[PDB]
Symmetry: C2
Subunit: 396 residues, 2 copies
């Protein structure tokens, strides 16, 4: 020993974590797309020399928080009229989930109760377990969701897992465009889910990362959140603007809180502020400024809804086209899930074996789960993808 | 029959934060002589925020570049920003940069850099998941520091002596004693320059004495660098202590903020610089940093980091920026000199050399709580109960009134 040992000497190397594996919108030319409305608002911001760079409030830009919560809940939401809604600007949807998880691990179902079960879908967003584990929750559980045989929602399994969940358990619910399956409950199925959650005092923590982006219509995509509000639930909703505004790298999110009465919102937000202060202090301005300007100008809002529907329509086109080509190519199995599914992501129903074939024989890159991003499909590669799927299904 | 109570019914209302209400009371005050010495950011002689000219210039260049997209940055952040930020702290000629034993994690301001570093240490430093390693912070220190380290899981936060109330400066002997008694491997959070809130910094010779104890007792330096260049106008002088520790062979963290020296407060631009003994550990440390970031903010925002990267990587913009930084530093130096001169011209009891010996925008004036109450209630001069003032709250127009009011407080109160 010649030298003093490094304090990092034992740090482990963390485990490593046509392209159908993208996780962001792409055009038919395989390119990123800055939304036209975003470019317009960025120019207005750049031309406004009165804007300064002083710290935003801990909880964020007030106009953004109000507009974001209105987007999720609806302008005429009774919860908004009754002043029992709070909004915390966050670092994307991830930051909203994290702040909400930190709050619940400190103040929900007792004080510092790390034992409340947290239920996530099987499968779910890959980062969700880490967010809740880091907040201190010791008991993360799964609810049945994807049915591999029917290629759709295992409603009876989901319902049984709700019925068997301890009272006050937290359920993380994808509000629409479930990631990674693309399979959402219908409104009637949502009503059954809500009924069990109401009876068993289960806490809805909605993750709304694809509102409007999902189906092309922002109002339809928020229906489940608004239904839970109308049924009298208190809930959280972690909103991301990464996908529906294409503002991935500006880290724009909002945590909406719905409580029974206004005083509870004040106390909850006061604890939120403490959590934020020691995490990022206060949030960045640029992306929230873009969203606030867009949502508070009816002309910009209308332009934005058009841009969102353009993205959804290109995806809906790729879904309709892929299913038609697979059905035209005498492909075994049912493929109505390709168009029943909603959003960018689709569980194709292909086992890893069929997946390895597409990566090493045909050089389509997709995840072992069979998840594809429909934004990786184009008018130019569709017939090649569809044919290669037909070979993966009939040969391997 | 009765509606059930909210699941939030037992959530307490958090304690009010004093500085927030102080600013609120200042805004309410109708007196035209009122002065806000409680502001937490740079202000011009006309009491205004200042967007740096170089920042406006780079923002226009970014806005006019339609080829930039909004796709996610890497988890660890924009590569050019991380490299430029670490080079600013360590110097172009750093031995650690030459030896490829430096990593940089883009963070949400200095706060985010402190938080990620604390989370890493609580998981991988001095054992696996060792929440018991003592973390030492200065008395007093940055108001949010304890909360950052507590939330990261550290159970034993301690103070080292630092501000000497009687001498209006550094309690070097107390600090050295607290270093000498610190358990081996304890973490010390050290302000690199422009101590917040006191303005009192160790001299280079005092830093050498501090480093000597830390080297001998294997104490870990976690530098907080929020005022590089802003503090004195000289980027190298303001980084001297960090660079001295690197030269002396320390491994260290350095949490860098660009909120003050770029005026980019609301774009949340920071960087955590890691200096390791051997190049191979940087990849391992950064792989764990990635996991921590992923579950906190996923990946960092682009706008502020783009501005900083463009400025630091272009010689013309860099030179303009160093001039903008000097403008801020020089205004603060002027207010310190002018306030001290007036207090001495009024023959105010006590010594006032701390007003110019201190560095950066914050100053522990030495006023006691009752004197602070007098300044707020009788003179409409707003400052913290600790006696902390922001020198940027002083202006050519208010200097006489502030100095006269301080003289009244010192001679009439307590």
């Amino acid at each position: 020993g010649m030298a003093p040992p490094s304090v990092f000497a034992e740090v482990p190397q963390a485990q490593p974590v046509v392209n159908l594996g993208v996780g962001a919108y792409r055009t038919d030319d395989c390119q990123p797309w800055v939304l036209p409305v975003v470019r317009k608002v960025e120019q207005r911001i750049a031309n406004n020399s009165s804007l300064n760079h002083e710290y935003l409030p801990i909880l964020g830009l007030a106009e953004f928080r109000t507009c974001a919560s209105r987007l999720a809940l609806g302008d005429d939401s009774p919860a908004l009229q009754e002043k029992r809604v709070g909004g915390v600007q966050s670092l994307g949807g991830t930051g909203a989930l994290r702040i909400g998880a930190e709050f619940l691990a400190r103040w929900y179902n007792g004080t510092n109760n790390k034992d409340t079960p947290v239920y996530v879908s099987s499968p779910t967003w890959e980062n969700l377990n880490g967010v809740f584990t880091t907040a201190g929750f010791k008991d993360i559980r799964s609810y049945r969701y994807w049915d591999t045989e029917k290629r759709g929602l295992d409603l009876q399994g989901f319902l049984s897992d709700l019925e068997n969940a301890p009272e006050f358990s937290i359920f993380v619910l994808h509000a629409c465009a479930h990631n990674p399956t693309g399979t959402d409950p219908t409104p009637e199925q949502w009503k059954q889910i809500a009924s069990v959650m109401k009876r068993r005092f289960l806490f809805p923590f909605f993750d709304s990362a694809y509102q409007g982006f999902a189906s092309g219509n922002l109002e339809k995509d928020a229906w489940a959140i608004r239904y839970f509000v109308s049924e009298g639930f208190e809930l959280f909703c972690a909103q991301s603007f990464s996908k529906n505004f294409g503002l991935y790298n500006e880290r724009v999110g909002n945590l909406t809180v719905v409580a029974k009465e206004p005083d509870s919102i004040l106390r909850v937000l006061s604890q939120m502020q403490k959590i934020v202060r020691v995490t990022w202090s206060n949030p960045p301005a640029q992306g929230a400024r873009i969203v606030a300007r867009t949502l508070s100008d009816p002309e910009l809002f209308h332009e934005w809804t058009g841009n969102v529907k353009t993205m959804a329509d290109r995806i809906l086109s790729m879904r309709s086209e892929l299913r038609a080509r697979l059905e035209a190519l005498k492909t075994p199995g049912t493929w109505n899930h390709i168009t029943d599914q909603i959003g960018m992501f689709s569980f194709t129903g292909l086992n890893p074996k069929q997946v390895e074939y597409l990566i090493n024989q045909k050089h389509i890159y997709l995840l072992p789960s069979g998840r594809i991003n429909m934004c990786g499909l184009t008018t130019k590669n569709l017939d090649y993808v569809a044919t290669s799927i037909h070979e993966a299904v009939t040969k391997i």
